């Protein structure tokens, strides 16, 4: 659990996120909880040119490490860590299906039993605020109080979990749920859902 | 036809299922008929970390082999083997188009002549029941009486055949049929179908 | 222009057709004009297991070479060669967008200037008849009189051209046109088209 | 900044454009500003067979280099360089989502904050004119006056930027925006947009 090992894992998560089709260009960013702050990828460096030296340490006070590039969306990663003590890794991306649902400003309802992976019977959609603002941070903190993932209106997705592998796995499951929702919404609105009783049973089993 | 060779084949089927885009994360599972029970993949191990030692033998009585991980959906694989004596391999996944049709709770009708590959003029959709329950097992057993594949409402797909290669091949053909159905349903409902007379001719030819 | 070189080229076309996402499983088949008949791939052998020895010579009289596997759709390849003397290679597949348009039983109209690549202002859709029948052959022969590609209702696509590379290239362009048509049809029906005057200009330029 | 290095970069951009799924077959073409004209890829050579010797120099007067293949869409690349002095690289392709929006003859409105990457609150759609004509060149020049990318009605996309990497990056972001727009248009028309006030804030931040 030293810095260089975590940096390697962050870079591998970025590569896998791109291979799964969730990250295109420079939209995504990943972080892990570390010491009193987090290690995060910088803005604007494509995944394939990322090296261990690019990873930035931002402390608990928001001070950025000397000589590193900026990460313009760092504030909502820190908001996730403060809102969910149990989160140790945060994945952000603008995956296409998640993002399309966020444009409609809809939560994803219980259309499939795997919705329980994010903690409840829905994937919420937090209201729009400019990237990098305190306002956006507060909406994210409130959406993650009782959920491990949330859509960001007109923006994309945030998913958090106990480690990088589970956070990426969750981000991918939410993109699958978003694709299922949009595909079925085009045919019938509203889409059939499982009852709260049924999701309660699934949550216990998980 | 020894255990290690079949284990290898199960792992290769998992890899191919992922390459074809039918399996994402840990949703899919594959089994083969073996001795008095079956060999199956365990729950929660991503395809890329699967080894021969992970494959679990579950006997005819439902006893799990010592020291292996659980497979929470094993009951509907055993239900398939008991319902269809001719089935020697079972593929389960949550492929996106198959799963979207299962959310609509519709059977796939005879929109293409390749629907006859599953045995008749449709791909049924079995009613929802919690994963791992006897109730879900009974719905699957009834749906597979006269069909080699079935959708599972709010869940995914089950396909069975005489060997692993044909079972995967069938699972992929059903995902293609589901994509054809959703794509055309978005434009016109209902979608034009081939008559029962025409499917009877195709079934004889196959 | 010896048999072994053409067999190699047929196998490479099969591989590329799969890489482009146009061919899945065992649905596609490819042929080239050769001596008094054609060389074609057999039914049921997946692309990855195809060898030079699998390629079948079918003469002008329809006699199949000794000891080879059958090709159940050979008749419409021969119908293409007889209908279009200029065709030297024929590609058949069940590409998803082409096939979805064929289920709707619609021709693809001039929604994009590249429609002229198939010879006119449309991609026709030939009426359904059972695969392998003389009836299906006659519908294909008539559809290809003035076009180099045609959809097959409830079935898929046939594209022909002067060599294997151009035939595959055309098949891919028709799949792109079909995807453009279905994507726009879901939003507005009918879809805006270029006038016959404009397609005439493009045809001259090509 | 010698010719051979730029030729290599053009070929690598072509390969990456194909890997990202933006270019299929021979539809796309790329250029860079060079001396008094530009270096561009020729018409009809598939990306995989492109060599450094294929790259064509077209001067400021429109004279083509001796012994090279033609590039039938060269005129709108030159129109981009003359209209936008700051552009040093131009990417053209017929990416499917961009092209479908161009068939509808719609601009892409501010459905996502990344629309500001092209310079304003929209991606315009320039009116149809035959490829290779002065008329098409004039429509492109006018559309790029205040935007770095534009759709071409019934045709495709043009994107320009300060170097090849940023031009490709922009082309991909516009294809993502087009996919978001079509996916949401199928569910609700019109699609919710960010206000001009909000895009003004984002533009300043960028
Ligand atoms: Zn973002
Ligand atoms: Zn399942
Ligand atoms: Zn066929
Ligand atoms: Zn073009």
First-residue to last-residue Cα distance in chain C: 28
**Alpha helical stretches, state H, D105-195:** 134-143, 164-185
d(CA C141, CA A66): 72
Q: Write out chain B residues lying below 8 Å of C185, CB-based.
A: 187
Task: Decide the pairing of beta strands B149-152 and B125-126.
Answer: parallel
D94 contacts C184? CB cut-off 8 A: no
Work out whether strand B37-40 and strand B29-34 pair parallel, antiparallel, or are unpaired.
antiparallel
CA distance A165 to A171: 10
Cβ-contact B115, B121 below 8 angstroms: yes
Classify the phi-psi angles of D198: left when phi > 0, otherwise alpha if psi is within -120 to 50, otherwise beta.
alpha
Token output for A104: 């409609």
Question: Which chain B residue lies closest to C22 (C-alpha atoms)?
Answer: B176
Contact call for D205 and A130, based on CB within 8 A: yes
Residues with CB under 5 A from ligand 3 (ion): C 156
Q: Is D128 on the interface with A (CB under 8 A)?
A: no
Q: How far apart are CA A8 and CA C47, in angstroms?
A: 38
Whether D86 contacts D162, CB under 8 Å: yes
Please identify which residue in the block is written with the tokens 């509203």: A190
- The residues facing B126 across adjacent strands are B152
Kindly report the number of other CB atoms within 10 A of residue A95's CB atom.
Answer: 29
Taking alpha carbons only, the member of D41, D180, D66 closest to residue D115 is D180
Q: What is the resolution of this structure in A?
A: 1.7
Residue A35 CA from chain centroid, whole number: 21
Beta bridge partners of A151: A125, A157
First-to-last alpha carbon distance for chain B, in angstroms, is 28
User: How many Cβ atoms sit within 10 Å of the Cβ of residue C65?
Assistant: 12
In this structure, the strands spanning C37-40 and C29-34 are antiparallel
Q: Give CA torsion, residues B195, B197, B202, B204, to 10 deg.
A: 160
User: Catalytic amino acids of A?
Assistant: 73
For the record, the structure tokens of A98 come out as 């998640």
D75 Cβ under 8 Å from any chain A Cβ = no
Burial C127-147 (b: 16+ CB within 10 A, else e): ebbebbeeebbbbbbebbeeb
DSSP for A131-183, written as a single string: TT-HHHHHHHHHHTSS-SEEEETTTEEEEEESSHHHHHHHHHHHHHHHHHHHH
State the burial class of residue C5 (Cβ atoms within 10 Å of its Cβ: 0-12, 13-18, 19+). Answer: exposed
Nearest to A99 among D112, D191, D194 (CB): D112
Q: Which long-range contacts (CB under 8 A, 24 or more apart) does A183-186 make?
A: A183/B96, A183/B97, A183/B100, A183/B182, A184/A111, A184/B100, A184/B103, A184/B104, A185/D187, A186/B186, A186/C186, A186/D186, A186/D187
Residue D134, number of CB atoms within 10 A of its CB: 10
Taking chain A, what is the end-to-end CA distance rounded to the nearest angstrom?
28
Q: How many residues does chain D have?
A: 206
Is residue B108 within 8 Å of B179, Cβ to Cβ? no
Backbone φ and ψ for C89, nearest 5 degrees, come out as -150, 145
Residues 6 or more apart whose CB falls under 8 angstroms from that of C77 comprise C29, C31, C38, C40, C90, C92
Phi and psi for A101 in degrees, rounded to 5? -65, -35
Alpha carbon of D114: minimum distance to chain A alpha carbons (Å):
8
Domains defined along chain B, listed by start: 1-206 (3.40.225.10)
The radius of gyration computed from the CA coordinates of chain C, to the nearest angstrom, equals 17
At A130, is the secondary structure helix, strand, or coil?
coil
D20 close to A (CB below 8 A): yes
Cβ contacts below 8 Å, chain A against chain D, sum to 59
DSSP letter at C82 equals H
* Backbone CA torsion sign across D103, D104, D105, D110: negative
B180:C104 CB<8 A: no
Asked how this structure was determined, the answer is: X-ray
Closest ligand to C-alpha of residue C91 is: 3
């Amino acid at each position: 659990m030293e810095r260089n090992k975590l940096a390697r894992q962050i870079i591998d998560t970025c590569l896998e996120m791109t291979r799964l089709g969730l990250n295109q260009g420079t939209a995504g960013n990943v972080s892990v909880r570390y010491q009193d702050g987090m290690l995060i990828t910088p803005t604007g460096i494509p995944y394939e040119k990322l090296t261990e030296s690019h990873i930035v340490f931002i402390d608990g006070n928001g001070k950025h490490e000397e000589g590193k590039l900026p990460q313009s969306e760092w504030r909502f990663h820190m908001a996730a860590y403060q809102s969910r003590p149990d989160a140790n890794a945060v994945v952000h991306n603008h995956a296409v299906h998640c993002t399309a649902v966020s444009i409609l400003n809809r939560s994803i309802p219980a259309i499939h039993y795997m919705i329980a992976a994010a903690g409840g019977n829905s994937i919420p959609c937090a209201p729009y605020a400019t990237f990098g603002t305190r306002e956006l941070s507060e909406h994210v903190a409130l959406a993650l109080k009782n959920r491990k993932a949330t859509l960001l209106q007109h923006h994309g997705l945030i998913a958090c979990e106990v480690n990088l592998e589970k956070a990426l796995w969750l981000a991918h499951e939410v993109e699958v749920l978003a694709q299922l929702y949009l595909t079925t919404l085009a045919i019938t609105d509203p889409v059939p859902v499982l009852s709260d009783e049924e999701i309660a049973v699934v949550l216990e089993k998980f």
